[PDB]
Design a protein around this nucleic acid. Structure first.
Ligand SMILES: Cc1ccnc2c1NC(=O)c1cccnc1N2C1CC1
Ligand SMILES: [Ca+2]
Lengths: 412, 555
RNA sequence: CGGCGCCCGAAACAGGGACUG
DNA sequence: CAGTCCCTGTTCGGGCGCC
């Protein structure tokens, strides 16, 4: 018996009608045991064929957790509620959250089930629990309360949240708190000991206000940027000078002051790839002068809030992956490298799933926005397995790309 | 007052729209005199009504005919009402595959009579139903009425039936955790591991529960008829099989024959192992008429032969035993065709299938296997809800070499080796580093956009040159073409410098087969070499003998 | 007429390369 | 800066097979 903030699909578009993808018996079980319980609690309740809307759902275990979390893919709804969240209520992004020596991510999504949801909107939370082999038809529900993972839910709960938090924020003014969907990012420069204590401390503030919380730590001050680097060579084979020249030629789309002229001239005749040609000083100095232009920043690269972020990931082999975040080509906001992620040396799809998450996470701590991925994978492979390795409560946007490697040169 | 059977399902109209008024369209003149009476039947049973002022509604009739009836079946067309009616979430997501059913001791089928007419239409929507169709021919202008139930040919009927039916069964199931029901249309199939007679206890005890909601189930029903014939299948509680296949022996082959043909082989492929469609499928390329005349090649018939002998003997599938693991084994049938069997106990199969689909202009066996393994995982998750243990014709070292080199993210789940030639191999590898003491062929090609004319050639560190004129070509083919030369004219180890990002993208993915004869030849040369290092440089940077081979061919 | 599987086509869509002064 | 082509892959459309 409290008010309910009405919600509307931005003009012209209908509710999400998207199909439920097949689930494992494992996961279908977890949803059944999860939904019957959420029904008993009147969080969701059964629905009929008069409601022709569907959003996909599946289940996950969070990292280092043996407990099953339900997950709805509200991506399509969030696109169709979008004007509502972006234009109506803004959430200021702390530029310092990224500078903190430690940042913990707490899962607060459960609190959202407190607030009721506007009855006219509920027909848009429809999701099917599928059956193995189509033996039964689907068990269909819709959300009565604020659904986890919808973009309106953290918005409408914005007010209620800011309330419960003000004591801690007031008592601890030096601690930074951000909220992105079902997740709460909390970070501080306190030594981890007093930090972990302050997080438990933060846990009570919401624990006693009626919330549950199923390590979480990040270390943003330590986040490194992978700069472009030309190899260190004693003696150069023709092939070396060439791979070098080509790479430099690529880099110059990014850094315009690059010149290949004297390094280029070194290759003049028709010579064996493996013959060793010595570096003239005039080129040797141009190359080293090039190595310089490559420790710098790039004129006019800055984050622009209105534009979407784009992330490109490359498989470098032997467990390594490189990525780049940018909103416009060749103007990169961050570049990096990953190695020895889970699955390294055994499962590429696992590693990339891991990769997409680590990238999405930094993307949220830094600009407070999830990127759109260009995934180096065939559609169906990713689409078939990505759901097994997924440990996150959000779902970034992605498209599939194939590039035979000339862009691999991000890493030696 | 009429009476009230079972819970009603709210139905709206696409906002800002209202019921139809329509003129009739042709239907046969004979069968239509019977309903003039039949409508009068329904008034009393509760399936019809009427009101004078309130209906601005009229609807026509258009039909489709059916074989195998001992009585004729009436119909009405709401098509105008349909398009104006809200959409529903369809209840039939497709049908279960036989191989996914768990084995059940007892299995019966009850057929629901008055199935569509046993379901109440929504009170407030009833109005939109009013309709008229010719008496015998016709005489005086007419009369009209409204529908109290689910109308034949209405958009919401199957959906609302299906959902309602489900709602009814729900309380029975909870009181009977170990019974198993499945609903297809108006037929229910029930089954149990209970003892044979006590199972029949619950069959009546359920016909009770259905009637209690007004759902009629006669005893012409058969427990003794199984196998039941449902959608091409024959189902016995212990084992299943496809319904009998008729292979055309026709001497005259038109492209529509081969089509009907293929679909049958492919449909056969779920159970009979080793069906191959490749060569029969070649005929279909770039044909104008489905009625066109096409000949059978020797290959396609030799295959069709091998295929005909597989169908000779009968075969049956088993059911799934959740206690035991799933096993999937793939054999390479060559020409990018694959067959697989999925079983649990050895030599007793749940199902079979083929994967023949050739994906991309240039590909290889590792890729194609990877694809099949993926087709199979998906099919397995749909059907058993788990991924099989894979048995594969590929050395764990073959595979490790591919996926770890390939630029794409790629994976096969937990899987083991089966040594069952042909074994899958990689036919060549490119060196990762320059080859000492190999000739270095610098290659380029160029063609002219207007004349479609060009030349492909090379220069080497040894002084050896070549330029070949080529007609009716493209800029790309000359770049492929120069590499081809450089392979031919080189020894067993060779380095090649190309400036074609295009050419490089292809060769580096180590294709073993191509649509393009030129790539096939490159491949064939590639397999013969001992060591090949293929490198790329930017064009027109004044590089190497790259500038030199550029002058030779752009000239 | 819809669902699933499939075979083909590319009339179309998208991505990337290359030339045109 | 825009407009020609060349090449490849992914939507879609056709038409079978099972309803
Ligand atoms: C046609 C059909 C479709 C889906 N499931 C079943 C059936 N009918 C059966 O013949 C059947 C056979 C064996 C085991 N389950 C069966 N059943 C389940 C109900 C016990
Ligand atoms: Ca050239």
């Amino acid at each position: 018996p409290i008010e309910t903030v009405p919600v509307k699909l931005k003009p012209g578009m209908d509710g999400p009608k998207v199909k439920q993808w097949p689930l494992t018996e494992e996961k279908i079980k977890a949803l059944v045991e999860i939904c019957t319980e959420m029904e008993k609690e009147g969080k969701i309740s059964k629905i009929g064929p008069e409601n022709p809307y569907n959003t996909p759902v599946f289940a996950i275990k969070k990292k280092d957790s043996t407990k099953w979390r339900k997950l709805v893919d509200f991506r399509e709804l969030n696109k169709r509620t979008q004007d509502f969240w972006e234009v109506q209520l803004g959430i200021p992004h702390p530029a310092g959250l990224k500078k903190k020596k430690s940042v913990t991510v707490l899962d607060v999504g459960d609190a959202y089930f407190s607030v009721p949801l506007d009855e006219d909107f509920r027909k848009y939370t429809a999701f099917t629990i599928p059956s193995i082999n189509n033996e039964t038809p689907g068990i269909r529900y819709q959300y009565n309360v604020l659904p986890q993972g919808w973009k309106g839910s953290p918005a409408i709960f914005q007010s209620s949240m800011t309330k419960i938090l003000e004591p801690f924020k007031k008592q601890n003014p030096d601690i930074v708190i951000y909220q992105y969907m079902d997740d709460l990012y909390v970070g501080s420069d306190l030594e981890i000991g007093q930090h972990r204590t302050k997080i438990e401390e933060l846990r009570q503030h919401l624990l006693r206000w009626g919330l549950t919380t199923p390590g979480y730590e990040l270390h943003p001050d330590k986040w490194t940027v992978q700069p472009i680097v030309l190899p260190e060579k004693d003696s150069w084979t023709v092939n070396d000078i060439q791979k070098l020249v080509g790479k430099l030629n690529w880099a110059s789309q990014i850094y315009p002051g690059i010149k290949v002229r004297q390094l280029s001239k070194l290759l003049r005749g028709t010579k064996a790839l493996t013959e060793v040609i010595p570096l003239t000083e005039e080129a040797e100095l141009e190359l080293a002068e090039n190595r310089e232009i490559l420790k710098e920043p790039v004129h006019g690269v800055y984050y622009d809030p209105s534009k979407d972020l784009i992330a490109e990931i490359q498989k470098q082999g032997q467990g390594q992956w490189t990525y780049q975040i940018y909103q416009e080509p060749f103007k990169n906001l961050k570049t990096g490298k990953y190695a020895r992620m889970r699955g390294a040396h055994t499962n590429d799809v696992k590693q990339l799933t891991e990769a997409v998450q680590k990238i999405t996470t930094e993307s949220i701590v830094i600009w407070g926005k999830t990127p759109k991925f260009k995934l180096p994978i065939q559609k169906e492979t990713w689409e078939t397995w990505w759901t097994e390795y997924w440990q996150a409560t959000w779902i970034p946007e992605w498209e599939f790309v194939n590039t035979p490697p000339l862009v691999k040169l991000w890493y030696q | 007052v009429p009476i009230s059977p079972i819970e009603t399902v709210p139905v709206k109209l696409k906002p800002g729209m209202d019921g139809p008024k329509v003129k009739q369209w042709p239907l046969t003149e004979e069968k239509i005199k019977a309903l003039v009476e039949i409508c009068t039947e329904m008034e009393k049973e509760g399936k019809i009504s009427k009101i004078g002022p309130e209906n601005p509604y009229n609807t026509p009739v258009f039909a489709i005919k059916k074989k195998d009836s001992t009585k004729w079946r009436k119909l009405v067309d709401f098509r105008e009402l349909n398009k104006r009616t809200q959409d529903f979430w369809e209840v039939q997501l497709g049908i279960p595959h036989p191989a996914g059913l768990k084995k059940k001791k007892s299995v019966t089928v009850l057929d629901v009579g008055d199935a569509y007419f046993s379901v109440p239409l929504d009170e407030d929507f009833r109005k939109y139903t009013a309709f008229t169709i010719p008496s015998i021919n016709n005489e005086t202008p007419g009369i009209r009425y409204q529908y109290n139930v689910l109308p034949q040919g209405w958009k919401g009927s199957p959906a609302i039936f299906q959902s309602s039916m489900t709602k009814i069964l729900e309380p029975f199931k909870k009181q009977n955790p170990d019974i198993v029901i499945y609903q297809y249309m108006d037929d229910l199939y029930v089954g149990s591991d209970l003892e044979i007679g006590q199972h029949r206890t619950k069959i009546e005890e359920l016909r009770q529960h259905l009637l209690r909601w007004g759902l009629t189930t006669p005893d012409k029903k058969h427990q003794k008829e199984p196998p039941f014939l449902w959608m091409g299948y024959e189902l016995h509680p212990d084992k299943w099989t496809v319904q009998p296949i008729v292979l055309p022996e026709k001497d005259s082959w038109t492209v529509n024959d081969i089509c009907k043909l293929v679909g049958k082989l492919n449909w056969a492929s779920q159970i009979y192992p080793g069906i191959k469609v490749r060569q029969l499928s070649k005929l279909l390329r770039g044909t104008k008429a489905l009625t066109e005349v096409i000949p059978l090649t020797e290959e396609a018939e030799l295959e069709l032969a091998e295929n005909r002998e597989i169908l000779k003997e009968p075969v049956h599938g088993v059911y799934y035993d959740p206690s035991k693991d799933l096993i999937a084994e793939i054999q390479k049938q060559g020409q990018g065709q694959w067959t697989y069997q999925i079983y649990q106990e050895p030599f007793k199969n749940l199902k079979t299938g083929k994967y023949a689909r050739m994906r991309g202009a240039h590909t290889n066996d590792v890729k194609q296997l990877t694809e099949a393994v993926q087709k199979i995982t998906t099919e397995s998750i749909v059907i058993w809800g788990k991924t099989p243990k894979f048995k594969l014709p590929i050395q764990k070292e073959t595979w490790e070499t591919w996926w770890t080199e390939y630029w794409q993210a790629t994976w096969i789940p937990e899987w083991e080796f089966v040594n069952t030639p042909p074994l899958v191999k990689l036919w060549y590898q490119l060196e990762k580093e320059p080859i000492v003491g190999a000739e270095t062929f610098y290659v380029d090609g160029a063609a002219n956009r207007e004349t479609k004319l060009g030349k492909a050639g090379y220069v080497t560190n040894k002084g050896r040159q070549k330029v070949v004129p080529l007609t009716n070509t493209t800029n790309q083919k000359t770049e492929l073409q120069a590499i081809y030369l450089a392979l031919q004219d080189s020894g067993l180890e060779v380095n090649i410098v190309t400036n074609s990002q295009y050419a490089l993208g292809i060769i580096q993915a180590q294709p073993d087969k191509s649509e393009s004869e030129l790539v096939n030849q490159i491949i064939e040369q590639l397999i013969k070499k001992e060591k090949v290092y293929l490198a790329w440089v930017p064009a027109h940077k004044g590089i190497g003998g790259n500038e030199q081979v550029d002058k030779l061919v752009s000239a």
